[PDB]
């Protein structure tokens, strides 16, 4: 068993990497085509004298910006159900009616918006950890992802990213597998003298939409 089993294992690894290579190529063209179609749709509507209304965002990223002292019970429970138990923790949330009302209850304690592909990729690559047997395991290899999410068809870190940004049938399982992200304070500061006002009123909490990408990247 010195060279027969090892050769078979190496051959299997070669096949697995080929499958991942083709999937990542297919994901790249899927992202590129979708982005160009949206851009061209806006131009066509303007040329015809109409307005193209983009579909509402289906994914948000929520960051807790408030400490753990002096929190009313109902908002405190909602933060626990979103796995935000310490300051500068973040999770992804699928956007439905049942989850929009949850965000309204915790507005003065969090900052959330609409993440982009670049933000999602950097979060998973640098601070992506998996919950395996109630333990926080770093995602340093594709095998540990396949061993835990393979039954859902996810067998690489890019497949996990694909399931997140495009909210797929197995978003709940893929998202819950990821450990809540542990972020630091922003490198260049928060940009405001006082955080605990709404973003509209010059504060930090609430929904800042696409501006969440600049905040998260400085905290990542």
């Amino acid at each position: 068993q010195v060279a027969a089993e090892r050769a078979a294992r190496k051959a299997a690894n070669k096949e697995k990497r080929a499958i991942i290579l083709e999937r990542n190529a297919a994901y790249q063209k899927e992202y590129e085509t979708a982005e160009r179609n949206i851009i061209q749709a806006k131009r066509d509507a303007k040329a015809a004298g109409s307005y193209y209304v983009e579909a509402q965002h289906k994914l948000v990223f929520v960051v807790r910006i408030k400490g753990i002292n002096k929190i009313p019970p109902k908002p405190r429970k909602v933060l626990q159900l979103l796995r935000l138990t310490r300051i500068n923790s973040g999770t992804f949330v699928k956007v439905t009616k049942a989850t929009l009302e949850l965000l309204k209850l915790i507005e003065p304690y969090v900052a959330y918006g609409y993440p982009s592909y670049s933000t999602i990729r950097q979060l998973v690559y640098k601070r992506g950890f998996g919950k395996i047997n109630k333990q926080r395991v770093p995602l340093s290899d594709n095998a540990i992802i396949e061993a835990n999410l393979g039954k859902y068809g996810i067998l690489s870190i890019d497949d996990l990213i694909h399931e997140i940004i495009t909210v797929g049938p197995h978003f709940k399982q893929a998202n819950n597998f990821l450990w809540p992200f542990k972020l630091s304070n922003p490198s260049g500061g928060w940009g405001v003298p006082r955080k605990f006002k709404h973003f509209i009123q010059g504060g930090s909490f609430g929904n800042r939409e696409e501006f969440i990408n600049k905040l998260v990247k400085s905290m990542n």
Binding site: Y51, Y52, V53, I200, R208, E209, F211
Partner: protein, 171 residues
């Protein structure tokens, strides 16, 4: 902040009884689009029976100054709340763009009347096309032919703690 002017177009949510509701547009001065959409619903709820939950935003576009390197005289109509009562006010501002004139307007209201951003409504900003239609003396004095004025008592900034000669304020 540094203001930008956006156009925001909105509508009520279409239903089976009234498909294709009417489109409403207004021009908003704001530092970013998130605030601009918030201000849109603030004024729409003062004019029509609608709110954000029962409506939607159709399009938001930034509006640039057509001639940003031309000096213009602006007339501004504002409504603001003081410590007791609400008042209407007309002021005139000289600048090269609408966003620049609006920035001066907010600074002027805060300085002279202690009115914050939340207490001010910008009713209308319009360029005064013709001379002699300017009705404020603090603007008319800059509209004289061959205007010249010196800058007496120049003060120079020093980069060192100590200077080895008495300074001069000539200019």
């Amino acid at each position: 902040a540094h203001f930008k002017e956006y156009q925001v177009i909105g509508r009520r949510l279409p239903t089976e009884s009234v498909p294709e509701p009417k489109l409403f547009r207004m021009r908003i001065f704001a530092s970013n689009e998130v605030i601009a959409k918030s201000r849109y619903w603030y004024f729409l709820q003062k004019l029509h029976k609608v709110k954000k939950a029962s409506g939607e935003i159709v399009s938001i576009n930034q509006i640039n100054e057509a001639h940003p390197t031309k000096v213009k005289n602006f007339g501004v109509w504002v409504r603001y709340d003081s410590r007791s009562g609400t008042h209407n006010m007309y002021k005139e501002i000289r600048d090269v763009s609408r966003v620049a004139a609006v920035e001066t307007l907010y600074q002027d209201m805060a300085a002279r009347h202690r009115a914050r951003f939340r207490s001010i409504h910008i009713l209308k900003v319009a360029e005064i096309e013709k001379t002699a239609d300017v009705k404020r003396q603090y603007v008319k004095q800059f509209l004289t032919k061959d205007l010249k004025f010196p800058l007496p008592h120049r003060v120079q900034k020093s980069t060192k703690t100590f200077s080895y000669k008495r300074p001069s304020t000539f200019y």
